[PDB]
PDB file of N, CA, C and O and ligand atoms in Angstrom:
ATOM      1  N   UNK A   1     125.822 -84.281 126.494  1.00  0.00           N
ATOM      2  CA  UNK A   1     124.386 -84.089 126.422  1.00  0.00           C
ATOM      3  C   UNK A   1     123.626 -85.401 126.416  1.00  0.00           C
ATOM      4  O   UNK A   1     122.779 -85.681 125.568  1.00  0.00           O
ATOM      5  N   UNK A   2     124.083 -86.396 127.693  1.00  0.00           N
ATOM      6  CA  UNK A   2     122.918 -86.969 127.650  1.00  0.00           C
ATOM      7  C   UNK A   2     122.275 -87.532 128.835  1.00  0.00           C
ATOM      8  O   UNK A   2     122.492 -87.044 129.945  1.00  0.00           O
ATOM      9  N   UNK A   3     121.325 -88.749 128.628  1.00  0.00           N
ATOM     10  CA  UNK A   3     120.779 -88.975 130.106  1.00  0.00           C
ATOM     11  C   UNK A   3     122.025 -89.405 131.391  1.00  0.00           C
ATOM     12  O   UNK A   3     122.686 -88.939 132.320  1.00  0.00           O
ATOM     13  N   UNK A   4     121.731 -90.654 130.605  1.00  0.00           N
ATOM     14  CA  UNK A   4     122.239 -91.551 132.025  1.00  0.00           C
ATOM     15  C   UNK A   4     122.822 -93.063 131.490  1.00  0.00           C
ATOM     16  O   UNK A   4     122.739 -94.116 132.121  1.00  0.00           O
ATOM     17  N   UNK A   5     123.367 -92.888 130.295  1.00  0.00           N
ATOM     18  CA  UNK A   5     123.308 -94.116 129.794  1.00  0.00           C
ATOM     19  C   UNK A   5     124.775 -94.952 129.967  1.00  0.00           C
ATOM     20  O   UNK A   5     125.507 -95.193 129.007  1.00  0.00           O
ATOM     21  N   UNK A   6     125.009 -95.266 131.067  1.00  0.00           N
ATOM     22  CA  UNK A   6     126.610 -96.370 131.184  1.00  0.00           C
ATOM     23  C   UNK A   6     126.992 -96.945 130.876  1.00  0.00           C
ATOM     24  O   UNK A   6     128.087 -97.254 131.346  1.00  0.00           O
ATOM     25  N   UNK A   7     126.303 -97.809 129.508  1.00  0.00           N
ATOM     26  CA  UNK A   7     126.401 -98.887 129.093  1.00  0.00           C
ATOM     27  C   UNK A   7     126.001 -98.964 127.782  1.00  0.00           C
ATOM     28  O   UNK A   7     124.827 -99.285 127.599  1.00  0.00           O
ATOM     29  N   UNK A   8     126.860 -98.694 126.596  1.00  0.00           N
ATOM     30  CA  UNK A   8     126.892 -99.190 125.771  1.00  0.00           C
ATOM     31  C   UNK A   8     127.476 -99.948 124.537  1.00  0.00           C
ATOM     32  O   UNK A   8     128.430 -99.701 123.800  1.00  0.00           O
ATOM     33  N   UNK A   9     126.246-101.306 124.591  1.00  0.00           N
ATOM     34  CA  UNK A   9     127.352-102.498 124.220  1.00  0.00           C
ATOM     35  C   UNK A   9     126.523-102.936 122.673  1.00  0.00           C
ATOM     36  O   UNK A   9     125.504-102.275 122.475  1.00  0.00           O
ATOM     37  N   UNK A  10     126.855-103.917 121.651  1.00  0.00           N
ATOM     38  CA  UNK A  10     126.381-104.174 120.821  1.00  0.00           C
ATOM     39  C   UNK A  10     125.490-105.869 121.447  1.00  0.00           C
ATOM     40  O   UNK A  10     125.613-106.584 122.441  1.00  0.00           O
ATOM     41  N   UNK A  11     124.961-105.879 120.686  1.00  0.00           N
ATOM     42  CA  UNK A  11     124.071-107.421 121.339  1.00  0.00           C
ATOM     43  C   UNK A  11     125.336-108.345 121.473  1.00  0.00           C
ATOM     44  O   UNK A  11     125.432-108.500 122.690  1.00  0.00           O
ATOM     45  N   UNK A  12     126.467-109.117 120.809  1.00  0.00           N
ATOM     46  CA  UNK A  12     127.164-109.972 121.285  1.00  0.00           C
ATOM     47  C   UNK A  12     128.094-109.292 120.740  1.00  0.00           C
ATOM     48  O   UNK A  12     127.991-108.788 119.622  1.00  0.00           O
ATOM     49  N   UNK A  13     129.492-109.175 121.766  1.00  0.00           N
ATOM     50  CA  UNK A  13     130.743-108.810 122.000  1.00  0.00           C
ATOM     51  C   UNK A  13     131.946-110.178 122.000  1.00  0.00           C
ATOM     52  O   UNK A  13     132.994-110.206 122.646  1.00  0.00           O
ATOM     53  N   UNK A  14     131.451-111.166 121.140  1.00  0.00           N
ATOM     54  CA  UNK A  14     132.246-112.360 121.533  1.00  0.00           C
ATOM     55  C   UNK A  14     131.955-113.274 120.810  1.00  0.00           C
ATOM     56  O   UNK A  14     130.874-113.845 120.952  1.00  0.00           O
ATOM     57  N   UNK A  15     133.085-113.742 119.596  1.00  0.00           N
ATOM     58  CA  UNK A  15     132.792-114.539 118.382  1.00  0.00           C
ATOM     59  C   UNK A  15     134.391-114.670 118.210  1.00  0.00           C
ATOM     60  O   UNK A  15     135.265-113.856 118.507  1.00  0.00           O
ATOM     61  N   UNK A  16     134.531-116.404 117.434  1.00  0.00           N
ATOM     62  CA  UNK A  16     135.680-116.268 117.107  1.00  0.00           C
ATOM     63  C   UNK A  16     136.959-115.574 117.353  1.00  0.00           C
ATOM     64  O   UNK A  16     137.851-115.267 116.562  1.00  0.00           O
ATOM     65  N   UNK A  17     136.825-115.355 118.899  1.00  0.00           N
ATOM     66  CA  UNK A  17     137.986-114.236 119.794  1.00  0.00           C
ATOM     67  C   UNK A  17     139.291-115.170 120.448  1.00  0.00           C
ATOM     68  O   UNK A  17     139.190-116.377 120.225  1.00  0.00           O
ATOM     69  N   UNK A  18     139.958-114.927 120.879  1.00  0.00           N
ATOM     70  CA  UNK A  18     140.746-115.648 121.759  1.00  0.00           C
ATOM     71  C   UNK A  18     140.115-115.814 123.163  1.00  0.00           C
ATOM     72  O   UNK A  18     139.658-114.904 123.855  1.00  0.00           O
ATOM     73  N   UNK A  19     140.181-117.393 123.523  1.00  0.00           N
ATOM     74  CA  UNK A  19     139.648-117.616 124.661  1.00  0.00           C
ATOM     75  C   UNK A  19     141.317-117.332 125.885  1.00  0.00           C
ATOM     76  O   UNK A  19     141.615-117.953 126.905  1.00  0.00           O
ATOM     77  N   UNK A  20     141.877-116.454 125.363  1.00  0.00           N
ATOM     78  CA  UNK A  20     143.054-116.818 126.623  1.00  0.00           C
ATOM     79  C   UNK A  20     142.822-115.320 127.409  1.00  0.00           C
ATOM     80  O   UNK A  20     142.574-115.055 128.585  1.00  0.00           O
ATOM     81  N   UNK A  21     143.069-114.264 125.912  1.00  0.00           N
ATOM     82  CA  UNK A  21     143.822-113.107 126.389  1.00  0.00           C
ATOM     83  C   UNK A  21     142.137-111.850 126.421  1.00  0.00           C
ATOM     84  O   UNK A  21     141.847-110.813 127.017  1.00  0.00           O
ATOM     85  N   UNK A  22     141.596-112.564 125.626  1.00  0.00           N
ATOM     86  CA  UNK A  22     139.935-111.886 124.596  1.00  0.00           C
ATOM     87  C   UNK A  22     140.225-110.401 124.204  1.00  0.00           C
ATOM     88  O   UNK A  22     139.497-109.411 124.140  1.00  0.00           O
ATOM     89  N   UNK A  23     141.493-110.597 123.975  1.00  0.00           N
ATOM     90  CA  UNK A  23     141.995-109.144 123.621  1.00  0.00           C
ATOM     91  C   UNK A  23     142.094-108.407 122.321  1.00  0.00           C
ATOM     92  O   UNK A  23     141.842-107.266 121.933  1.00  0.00           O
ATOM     93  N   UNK A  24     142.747-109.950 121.601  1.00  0.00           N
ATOM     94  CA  UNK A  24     143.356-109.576 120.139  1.00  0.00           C
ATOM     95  C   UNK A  24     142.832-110.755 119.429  1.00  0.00           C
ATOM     96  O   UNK A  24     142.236-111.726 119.895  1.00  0.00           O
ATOM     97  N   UNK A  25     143.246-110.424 117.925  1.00  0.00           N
ATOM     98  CA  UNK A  25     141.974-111.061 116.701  1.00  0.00           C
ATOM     99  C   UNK A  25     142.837-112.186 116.777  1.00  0.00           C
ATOM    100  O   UNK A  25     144.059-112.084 116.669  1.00  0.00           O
ATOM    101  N   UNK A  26     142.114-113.472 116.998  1.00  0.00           N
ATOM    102  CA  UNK A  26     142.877-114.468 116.567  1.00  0.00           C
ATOM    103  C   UNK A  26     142.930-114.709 114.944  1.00  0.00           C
ATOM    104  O   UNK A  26     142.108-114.343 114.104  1.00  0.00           O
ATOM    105  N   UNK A  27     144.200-115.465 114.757  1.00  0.00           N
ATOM    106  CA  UNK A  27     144.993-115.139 113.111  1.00  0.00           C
ATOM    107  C   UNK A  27     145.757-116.380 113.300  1.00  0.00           C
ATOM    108  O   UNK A  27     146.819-116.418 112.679  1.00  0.00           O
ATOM    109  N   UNK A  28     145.426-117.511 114.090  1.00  0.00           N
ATOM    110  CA  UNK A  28     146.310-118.733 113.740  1.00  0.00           C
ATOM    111  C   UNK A  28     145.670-119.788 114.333  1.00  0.00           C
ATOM    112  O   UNK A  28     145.047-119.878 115.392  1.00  0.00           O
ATOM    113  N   UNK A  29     146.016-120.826 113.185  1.00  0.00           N
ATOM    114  CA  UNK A  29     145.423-122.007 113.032  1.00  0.00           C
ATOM    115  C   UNK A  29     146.018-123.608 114.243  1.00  0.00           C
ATOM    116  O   UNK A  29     146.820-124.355 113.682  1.00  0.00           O
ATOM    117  N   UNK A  30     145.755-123.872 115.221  1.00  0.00           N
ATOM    118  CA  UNK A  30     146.616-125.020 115.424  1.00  0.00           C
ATOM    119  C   UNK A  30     146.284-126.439 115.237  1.00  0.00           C
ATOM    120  O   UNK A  30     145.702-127.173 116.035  1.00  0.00           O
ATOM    121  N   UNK A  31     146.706-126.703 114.145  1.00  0.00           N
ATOM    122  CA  UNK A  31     146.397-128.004 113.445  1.00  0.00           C
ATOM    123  C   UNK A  31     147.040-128.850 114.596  1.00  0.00           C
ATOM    124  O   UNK A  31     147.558-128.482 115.651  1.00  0.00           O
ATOM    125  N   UNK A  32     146.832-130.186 114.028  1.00  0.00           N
ATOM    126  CA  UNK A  32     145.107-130.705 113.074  1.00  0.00           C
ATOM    127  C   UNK A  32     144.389-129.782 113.514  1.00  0.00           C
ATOM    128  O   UNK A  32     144.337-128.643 113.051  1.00  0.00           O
ATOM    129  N   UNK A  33     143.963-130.081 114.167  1.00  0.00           N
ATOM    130  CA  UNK A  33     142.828-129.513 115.003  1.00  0.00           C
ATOM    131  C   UNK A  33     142.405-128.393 114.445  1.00  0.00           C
ATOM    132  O   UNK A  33     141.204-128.237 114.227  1.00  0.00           O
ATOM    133  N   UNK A  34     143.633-127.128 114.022  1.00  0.00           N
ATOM    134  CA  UNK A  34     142.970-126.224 113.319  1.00  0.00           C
ATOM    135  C   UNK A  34     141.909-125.378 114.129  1.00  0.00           C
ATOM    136  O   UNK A  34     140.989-124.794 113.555  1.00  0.00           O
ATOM    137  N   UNK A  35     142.085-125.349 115.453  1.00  0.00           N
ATOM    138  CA  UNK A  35     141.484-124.040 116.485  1.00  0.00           C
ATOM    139  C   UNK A  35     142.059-123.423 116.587  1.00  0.00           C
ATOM    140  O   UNK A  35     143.142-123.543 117.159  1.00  0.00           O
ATOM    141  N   UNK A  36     141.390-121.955 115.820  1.00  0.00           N
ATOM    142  CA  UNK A  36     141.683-120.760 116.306  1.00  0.00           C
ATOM    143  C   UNK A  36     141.631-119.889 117.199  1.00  0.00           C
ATOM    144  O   UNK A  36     141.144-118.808 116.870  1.00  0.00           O
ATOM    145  N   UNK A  37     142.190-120.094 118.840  1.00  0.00           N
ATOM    146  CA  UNK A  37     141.790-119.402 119.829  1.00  0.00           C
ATOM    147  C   UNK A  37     143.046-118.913 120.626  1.00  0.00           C
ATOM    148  O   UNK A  37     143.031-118.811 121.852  1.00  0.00           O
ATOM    149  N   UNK A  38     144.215-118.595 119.792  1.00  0.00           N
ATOM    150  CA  UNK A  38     145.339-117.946 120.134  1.00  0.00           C
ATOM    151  C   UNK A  38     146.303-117.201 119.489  1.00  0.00           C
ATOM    152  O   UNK A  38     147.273-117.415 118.762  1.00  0.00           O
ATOM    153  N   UNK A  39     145.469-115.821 120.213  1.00  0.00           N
ATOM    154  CA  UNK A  39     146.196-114.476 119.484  1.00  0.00           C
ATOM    155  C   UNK A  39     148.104-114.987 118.910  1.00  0.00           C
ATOM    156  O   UNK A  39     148.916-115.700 119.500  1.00  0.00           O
ATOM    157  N   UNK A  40     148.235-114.174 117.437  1.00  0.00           N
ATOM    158  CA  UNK A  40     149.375-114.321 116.837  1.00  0.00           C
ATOM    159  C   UNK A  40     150.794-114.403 117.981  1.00  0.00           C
ATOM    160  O   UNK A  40     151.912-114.871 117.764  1.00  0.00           O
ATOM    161  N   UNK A  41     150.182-113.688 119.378  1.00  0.00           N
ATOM    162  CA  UNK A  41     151.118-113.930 120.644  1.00  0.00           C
ATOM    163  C   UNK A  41     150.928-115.109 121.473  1.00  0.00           C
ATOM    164  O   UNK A  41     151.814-115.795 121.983  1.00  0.00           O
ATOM    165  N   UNK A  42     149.669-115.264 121.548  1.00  0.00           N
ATOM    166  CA  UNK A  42     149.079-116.167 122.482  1.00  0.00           C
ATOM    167  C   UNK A  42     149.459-117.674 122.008  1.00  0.00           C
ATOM    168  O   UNK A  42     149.503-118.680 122.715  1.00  0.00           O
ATOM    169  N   UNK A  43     149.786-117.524 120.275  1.00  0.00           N
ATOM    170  CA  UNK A  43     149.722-119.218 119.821  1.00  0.00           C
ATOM    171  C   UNK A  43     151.170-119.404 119.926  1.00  0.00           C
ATOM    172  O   UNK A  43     151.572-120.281 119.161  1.00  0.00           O
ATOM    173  N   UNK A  44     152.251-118.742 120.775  1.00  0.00           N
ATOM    174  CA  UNK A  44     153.441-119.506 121.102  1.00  0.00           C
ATOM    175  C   UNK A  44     153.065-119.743 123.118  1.00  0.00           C
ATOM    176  O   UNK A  44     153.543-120.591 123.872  1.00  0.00           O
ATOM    177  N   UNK A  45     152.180-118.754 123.394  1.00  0.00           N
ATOM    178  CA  UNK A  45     151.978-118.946 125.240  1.00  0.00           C
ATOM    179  C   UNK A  45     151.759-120.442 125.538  1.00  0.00           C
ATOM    180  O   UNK A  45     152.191-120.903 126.594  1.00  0.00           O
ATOM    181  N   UNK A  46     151.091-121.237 124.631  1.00  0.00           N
ATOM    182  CA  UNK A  46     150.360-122.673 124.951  1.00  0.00           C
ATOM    183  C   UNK A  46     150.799-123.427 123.465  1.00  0.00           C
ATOM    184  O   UNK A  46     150.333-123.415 122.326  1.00  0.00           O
ATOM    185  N   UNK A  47     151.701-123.936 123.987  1.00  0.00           N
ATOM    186  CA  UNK A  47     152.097-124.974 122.605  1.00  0.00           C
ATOM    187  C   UNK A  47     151.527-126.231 122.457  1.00  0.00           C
ATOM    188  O   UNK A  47     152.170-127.126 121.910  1.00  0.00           O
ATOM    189  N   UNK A  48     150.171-126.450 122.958  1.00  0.00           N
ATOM    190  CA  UNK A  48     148.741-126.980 122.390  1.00  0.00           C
ATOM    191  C   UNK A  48     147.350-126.388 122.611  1.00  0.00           C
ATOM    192  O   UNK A  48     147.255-125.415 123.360  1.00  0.00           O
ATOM    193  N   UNK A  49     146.553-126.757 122.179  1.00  0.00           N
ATOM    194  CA  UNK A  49     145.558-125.933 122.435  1.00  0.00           C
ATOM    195  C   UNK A  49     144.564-125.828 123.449  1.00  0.00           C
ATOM    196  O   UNK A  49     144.183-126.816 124.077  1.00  0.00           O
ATOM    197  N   UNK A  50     144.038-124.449 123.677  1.00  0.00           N
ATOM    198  CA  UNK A  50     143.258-124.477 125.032  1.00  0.00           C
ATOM    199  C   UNK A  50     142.466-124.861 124.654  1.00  0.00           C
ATOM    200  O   UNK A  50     141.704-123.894 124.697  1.00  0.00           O
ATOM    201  N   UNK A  51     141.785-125.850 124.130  1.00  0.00           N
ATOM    202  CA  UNK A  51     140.675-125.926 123.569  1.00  0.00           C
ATOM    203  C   UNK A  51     140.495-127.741 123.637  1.00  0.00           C
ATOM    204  O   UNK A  51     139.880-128.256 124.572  1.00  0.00           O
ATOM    205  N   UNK A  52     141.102-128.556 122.548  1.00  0.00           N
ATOM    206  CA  UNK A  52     140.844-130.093 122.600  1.00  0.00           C
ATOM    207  C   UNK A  52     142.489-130.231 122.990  1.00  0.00           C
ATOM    208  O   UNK A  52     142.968-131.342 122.766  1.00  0.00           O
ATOM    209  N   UNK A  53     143.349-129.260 123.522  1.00  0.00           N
ATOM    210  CA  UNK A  53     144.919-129.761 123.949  1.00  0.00           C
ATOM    211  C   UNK A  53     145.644-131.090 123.519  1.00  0.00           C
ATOM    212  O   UNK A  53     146.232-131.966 124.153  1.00  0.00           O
ATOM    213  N   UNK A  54     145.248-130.801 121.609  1.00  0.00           N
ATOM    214  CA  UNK A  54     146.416-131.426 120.849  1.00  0.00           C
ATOM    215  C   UNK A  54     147.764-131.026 120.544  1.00  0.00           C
ATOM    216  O   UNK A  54     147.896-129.822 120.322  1.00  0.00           O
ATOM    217  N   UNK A  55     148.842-131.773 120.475  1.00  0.00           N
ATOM    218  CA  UNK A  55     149.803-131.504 120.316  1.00  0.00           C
ATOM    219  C   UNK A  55     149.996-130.672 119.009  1.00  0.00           C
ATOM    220  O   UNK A  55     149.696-131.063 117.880  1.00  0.00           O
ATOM    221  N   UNK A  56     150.515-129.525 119.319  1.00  0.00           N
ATOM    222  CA  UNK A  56     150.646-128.607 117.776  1.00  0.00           C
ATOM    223  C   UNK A  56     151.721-128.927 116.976  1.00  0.00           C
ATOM    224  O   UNK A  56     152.592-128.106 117.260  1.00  0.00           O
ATOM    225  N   UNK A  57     152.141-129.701 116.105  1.00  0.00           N
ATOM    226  CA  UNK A  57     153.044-129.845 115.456  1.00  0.00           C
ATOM    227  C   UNK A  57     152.831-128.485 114.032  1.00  0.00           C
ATOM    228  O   UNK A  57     153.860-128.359 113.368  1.00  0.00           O
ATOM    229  N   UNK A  58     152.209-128.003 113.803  1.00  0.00           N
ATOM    230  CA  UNK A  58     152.007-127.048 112.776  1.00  0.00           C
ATOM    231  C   UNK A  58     150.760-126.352 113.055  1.00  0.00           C
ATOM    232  O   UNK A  58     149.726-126.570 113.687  1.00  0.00           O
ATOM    233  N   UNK A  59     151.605-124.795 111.841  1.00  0.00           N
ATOM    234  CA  UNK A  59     150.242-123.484 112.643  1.00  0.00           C
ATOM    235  C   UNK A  59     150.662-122.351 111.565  1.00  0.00           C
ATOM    236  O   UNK A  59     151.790-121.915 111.337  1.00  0.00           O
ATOM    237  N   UNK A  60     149.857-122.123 111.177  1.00  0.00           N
ATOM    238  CA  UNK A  60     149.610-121.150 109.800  1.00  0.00           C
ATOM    239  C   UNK A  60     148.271-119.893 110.190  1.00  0.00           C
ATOM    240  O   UNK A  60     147.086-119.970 110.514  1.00  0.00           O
ATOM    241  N   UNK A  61     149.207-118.830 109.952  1.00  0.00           N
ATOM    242  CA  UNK A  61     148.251-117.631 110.194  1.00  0.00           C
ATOM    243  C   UNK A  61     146.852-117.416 108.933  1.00  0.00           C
ATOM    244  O   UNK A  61     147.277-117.500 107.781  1.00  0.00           O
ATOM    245  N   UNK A  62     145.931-117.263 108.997  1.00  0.00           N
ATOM    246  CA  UNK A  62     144.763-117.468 108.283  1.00  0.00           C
ATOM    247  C   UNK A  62     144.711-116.658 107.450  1.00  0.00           C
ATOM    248  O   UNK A  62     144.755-117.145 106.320  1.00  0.00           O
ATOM    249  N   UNK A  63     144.603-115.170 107.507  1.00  0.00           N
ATOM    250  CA  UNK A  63     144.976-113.804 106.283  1.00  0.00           C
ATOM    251  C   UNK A  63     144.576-114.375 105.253  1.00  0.00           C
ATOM    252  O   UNK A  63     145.250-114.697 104.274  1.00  0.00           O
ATOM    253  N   UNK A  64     143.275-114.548 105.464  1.00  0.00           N
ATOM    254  CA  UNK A  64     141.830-115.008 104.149  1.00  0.00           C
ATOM    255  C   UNK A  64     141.169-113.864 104.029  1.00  0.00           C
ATOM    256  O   UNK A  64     141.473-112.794 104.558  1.00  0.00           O
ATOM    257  N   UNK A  65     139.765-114.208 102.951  1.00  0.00           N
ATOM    258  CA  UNK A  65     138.948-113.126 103.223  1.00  0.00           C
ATOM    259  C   UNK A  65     138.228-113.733 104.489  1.00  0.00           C
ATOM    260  O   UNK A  65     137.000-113.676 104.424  1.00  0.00           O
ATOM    261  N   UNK A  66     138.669-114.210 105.441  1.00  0.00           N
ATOM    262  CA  UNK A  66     137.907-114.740 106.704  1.00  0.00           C
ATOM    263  C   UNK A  66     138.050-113.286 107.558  1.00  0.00           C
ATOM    264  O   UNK A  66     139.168-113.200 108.066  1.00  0.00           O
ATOM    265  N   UNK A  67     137.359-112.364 107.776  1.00  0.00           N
ATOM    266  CA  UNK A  67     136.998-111.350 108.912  1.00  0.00           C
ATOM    267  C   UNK A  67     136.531-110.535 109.572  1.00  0.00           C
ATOM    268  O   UNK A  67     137.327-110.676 110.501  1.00  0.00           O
ATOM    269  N   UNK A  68     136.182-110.115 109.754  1.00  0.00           N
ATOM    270  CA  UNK A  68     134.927-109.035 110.259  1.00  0.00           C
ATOM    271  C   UNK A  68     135.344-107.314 110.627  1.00  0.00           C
ATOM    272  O   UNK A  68     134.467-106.530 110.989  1.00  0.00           O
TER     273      UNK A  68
HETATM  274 ZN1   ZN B   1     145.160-113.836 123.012  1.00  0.00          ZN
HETATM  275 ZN1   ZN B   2     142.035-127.548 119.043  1.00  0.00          ZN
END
């Protein structure tokens, strides 16, 4: 029962997501650096980051009250 409506989205669909897969919640840290932009799968795909592509020597899943 309704018009015509195809599209509905919330105002922004895109925060703190993974820039690889934008699929799944990112949950890991890759120090230093400490960017979070690779899903708990994604942070073994690129063993530095897509982001400032430092070498990851260490990476700790976040499971704070950090989430939405
Ligand atoms: Zn991902
Ligand atoms: Zn980084």
């Amino acid at each position: 029962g309704s018009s015509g409506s195809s599209g509905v989205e919330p105002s922004e669909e895109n925060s703190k997501d993974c820039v690889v897969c934008q699929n799944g919640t990112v949950n890991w840290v890759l120090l230093p650096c400490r960017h979070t932009c690779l899903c708990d799968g994604c942070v073994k795909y690129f063993q530095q980051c897509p982001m400032c592509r430092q070498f990851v020597q260490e990476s700790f899943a976040l499971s704070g009250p950090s989430s939405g």
